[PDB]
Amino acid sequence: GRDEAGITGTWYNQLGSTFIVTAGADGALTGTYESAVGNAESRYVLTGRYDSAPATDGSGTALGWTVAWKNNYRNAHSATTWSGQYVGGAQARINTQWLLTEGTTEANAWASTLVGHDTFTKVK
Amino acid sequence: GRDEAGITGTWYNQLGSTFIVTAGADGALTGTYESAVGNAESRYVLTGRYDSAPATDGSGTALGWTVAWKNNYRNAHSATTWSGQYVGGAQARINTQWLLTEGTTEANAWASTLVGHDTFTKVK
Amino acid sequence: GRDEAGITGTWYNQLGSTFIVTAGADGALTGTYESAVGNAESRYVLTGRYDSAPATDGSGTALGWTVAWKNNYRNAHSATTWSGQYVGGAQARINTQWLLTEGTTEANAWASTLVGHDTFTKVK
Amino acid sequence: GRDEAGITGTWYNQLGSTFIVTAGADGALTGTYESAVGNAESRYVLTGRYDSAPATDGSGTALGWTVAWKNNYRNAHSATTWSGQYVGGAQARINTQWLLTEGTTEANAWASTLVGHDTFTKVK
Ligand SMILES: O=C(CCCC[C@@H]1SC[C@@H]2NC(=O)N[C@@H]21)NCCN(Cc1ccccn1)Cc1ccccn1
Ligand SMILES: O=C(CCCC[C@@H]1SC[C@@H]2NC(=O)N[C@@H]21)NCCN(Cc1ccccn1)Cc1ccccn1
Ligand SMILES: O=C(CCCC[C@@H]1SC[C@@H]2NC(=O)N[C@@H]21)NCCN(Cc1ccccn1)Cc1ccccn1
Ligand SMILES: O=C(CCCC[C@@H]1SC[C@@H]2NC(=O)N[C@@H]21)NCCN(Cc1ccccn1)Cc1ccccn1
Structure with a gap:
């Protein structure tokens, strides 16, 4: 993948969370x-997926x-998905938005899903 | 997983899209x-993940x-994530919200991400 | 406004909530x-805003x-915004997505915002 | 309103956009x-709304x-809603997420809505 080497490794967001990922040649993230x-x-x-053949026009890499x-240790009965793009270079970033859904009853399903945004960098 | 058998199989959304998934015992979706x-x-x-040990209180299963x-065939330089819950029974559903990010330049990144919602059923 | 008469009135969503609105000639919703x-x-x-001069190509009216x-009576220390479009005709609808933000401390701000979707009709 | 004076005035986001607002005693934003x-x-x-009686526990003010x-001059046949909170003090901020819906045909409504996030400050 074009950005296989750039994405692979350890990333940190603004909350102090740690994201450790391997990008595969066929678009896998594990x-x-x-x-x-x-x-x-x-x-x-x-687990996830990335664009292993991104545009060559200066655009980011969708993932x-x-x-x-x-x-x-724990079960929070919830899942988060991050959707965003990798932007390579000296100060590489992954810029994301996320959706965090918890299991709810039908009556409470309106309130099942948080939304937010995370920016990941290779330092901090 | 509690809902391994319920989730595994073919699903259809309101747009006529088809979602074919296998739920693994350790929380994997492929x-x-x-x-x-x-x-x-x-x-x-x-690829994705689900809660393989959901609450037993009538809540849905987060995935x-x-x-x-x-x-x-094609490359749309974009990725979608679906976040939601499986609700089992006679009229099983997966109720989701999604984020679709395309690769953009930095100047256009404000406009990188669509949001929407999909409901999947085992018929139609 | 093109859809002033269509939007103005009482609307109901899938939760049983009631939305009473007057659309003004200059784009206001109150x-x-x-x-x-x-x-x-x-x-x-x-309060809100709508497109008082929508496209004439069969598109919806953004609001x-x-x-x-x-x-x-109560203060939930929170605000919801609905963003969507009015679709006129025999079975008129307002199709929306929403963001509900509560006031939080800085440490809990990651979890400040719910997302969801409401469909409003003139009956039920 | 508790934060009437803090919110009222000129704000700038990370894109260089300008937000000029008056907060009213009864919760109005114009x-x-x-x-x-x-x-x-x-x-x-x-137009919009804010919590004119926020919590006194260090939480932000929802708006x-x-x-x-x-x-x-122009009509983009679209509307944006911002949902977020005001955080007062020396480096006051409004932290928001937004939904931008354009008018679409029914066939294209899945793609009607962008999501993003804006941070407003009183300088820049
Ligand atoms: O806490 C978790 C698991 C960890 C999520 C950490 C997230 S993932 C996105 C962001 N980026 C990170 O690095 N960390 C955070 N799930 C329960 C979320 N709950 C709320 C919550 C709110 C405040 C504090 C703790 N929990 C219950 C709940 C879910 C849905 C709707 C409504 N309510
Ligand atoms: O089209 C694709 C790939 C297929 C997505 C199908 C989605 S996934 C969610 C929903 N559920 C489904 O079953 N099908 C659909 N990606 C480009 C999206 N583009 C817009 C678009 C809009 C209208 C028609 C076609 N494309 C470019 C673009 C991305 C981001 C921001 C702004 N603009
Ligand atoms: O309840 C309210 C006010 C009423 C909102 C009703 C909404 S508006 C969208 C949808 N459409 C409707 O017609 N009704 C509903 N605000 C507090 C929301 N809280 C959670 C909540 C969850 C379940 C039940 C009650 N409250 C606290 C909270 C806010 C943010 C993040 C995390 N947590
Ligand atoms: O451009 C506008 C009006 C101005 C919006 C500026 C926003 S508001 C949020 C953010 N904060 C700001 O300060 N400025 C920006 N509406 C059309 C949006 N379009 C896409 C677009 C994408 C890139 C460049 C220009 N337009 C068409 C479209 C809407 C929906 C779905 C899919 N596609």
């Missing part, structure tokens, strides 16, 4: 996520991933 | 997505998945 | 909202409005 | 918006507003 906030401790499995917030 | 709309043809790889819109 | 769910009772002031969830 | 990007020129009317992108 790794682990550790949130600094919320009903979470230690690492969670993540997304999912974490279900269950591991051996 | 399969293929075919959109009835947009800059897409044929099937795309998807999410990603599709990067590149296959052997 | 009225009251009563939620069937959440930390809400009775009516709340709403949005805000409710801050404070009235004489 | 003013004008000028976007630095997109299909927009000069000022547009905005939202709408702009329909029609003025005497």
Whole structure:
């Protein structure tokens, strides 16, 4: 993938969370996520996909991933998806928006889903 | 997983798209997505995660998945993530919200991301 | 406004909430909202804007409005915005997505905002 | 309103857009918006609402507003809603997420709505 080497590695967001990812040649993202906030401790499995053949016109590389917030320690009965783009270079970034859905009853489903935004960098 | 059997199989949304998924015992979702709309043809790889040990209080099962819109036919330089919950029973559903990010220049990144909602059923 | 007469009046969503609105000739929306769910009772002031000169090509009419969830009875320290389009005709609809933000501390601001979707009709 | 004086005035976001607002004693927001990007020129009317009696526990003040992108110069057949919170003090901010809906045909309504996030400050 064009940005396989750029994406692969450890990333940090503005909350102090850690995103460890391997980008595969056929568009796969695999790794682990550790949130600094919320009903979470230690690492969670993540999986996702990226554009392995992005535009050559200076555009970012589209990607997304999912974490279900269950591991051996805790289960928050919730999943987050991040959708965004990798922007390579000296100060590389992944700029994302996310959707965090919890399991609800039907009566409470209107209130099932948080939205927010995370910016990941290779330092901090 | 509690809902492994319920989630696994073929799903259809209100647009006429087809979602084919296998739920794994350790929380994995793998399969293929075919959109009835947009800059897409044929099937795309998807991966994601679900809560394999949901609450037993009548709540839904939280899940999410990603599709990067590149296959052997087309590349839309974009990725969609779906975040939502599975609601089992006679008229099973997956109720989702989604984020579709395209690769953009920095100047156009404000306009990188669509949001919407899909409801999947086992018929239609 | 082209759709002034179509928008003006009483609307109901899938939750059983009631949206009472007057569309003005210069693009204003004014009225009251009563939620069937959440930390809400009775009516709340709403204000917003619509496109008073929409495209004549069969497109919908873009609009949005805000409710801050404070009235004489309760204060939920939160605001919802609805963004969507009016689609006129025998089975008129307003199709919306919404953002509901509560006041939070800085440490909890990641979790400040719910997202969802409401469909309003002139019956039910 | 507790934060009437803090909110009232001129605000700037990270795109270079300008938000001019008056906060009323009964929760109203009125003013004008000028976007630095997109299909927009000069000022547009905005209206919205804020929590005029926020929590006294260090939480932000919830608010939202709408702009329909029609003025005497241009009509983008679209509306944006911002939902967020005011955080007062030496480096006051309004932290928002937004939904921008354009009028579409029914076939294209899946793609009607952009999502993003704006941070407003009293300088820049
Ligand atoms: O806490 C979790 C798991 C960890 C999420 C951390 C997120 S992922 C996005 C962001 N980026 C990060 O690095 N960390 C955070 N899920 C429960 C979320 N709950 C609310 C919540 C709110 C405040 C504090 C703790 N929890 C319950 C709930 C879900 C849905 C709707 C309404 N309510
Ligand atoms: O079309 C695609 C790939 C297929 C997406 C189909 C979606 S996924 C969610 C929904 N559920 C489905 O089953 N199908 C659809 N990506 C380009 C999206 N573009 C816009 C678009 C708008 C209208 C028609 C076609 N394309 C460019 C663009 C992306 C971001 C921001 C702004 N603009
Ligand atoms: O309840 C309210 C006011 C009424 C909102 C009703 C909404 S508006 C959209 C939808 N359409 C309708 O007709 N009714 C509903 N605000 C507090 C929301 N809270 C959560 C909540 C969740 C479940 C039940 C009650 N409250 C606290 C909170 C806000 C943000 C983030 C995280 N958490
Ligand atoms: O451009 C406008 C009006 C101005 C919006 C400026 C926004 S408001 C949020 C953000 N904050 C700001 O200060 N400025 C920006 N509406 C058309 C948006 N269009 C896309 C667009 C994309 C790139 C460049 C210009 N336009 C068409 C369209 C709407 C919906 C879905 C899919 N596509």
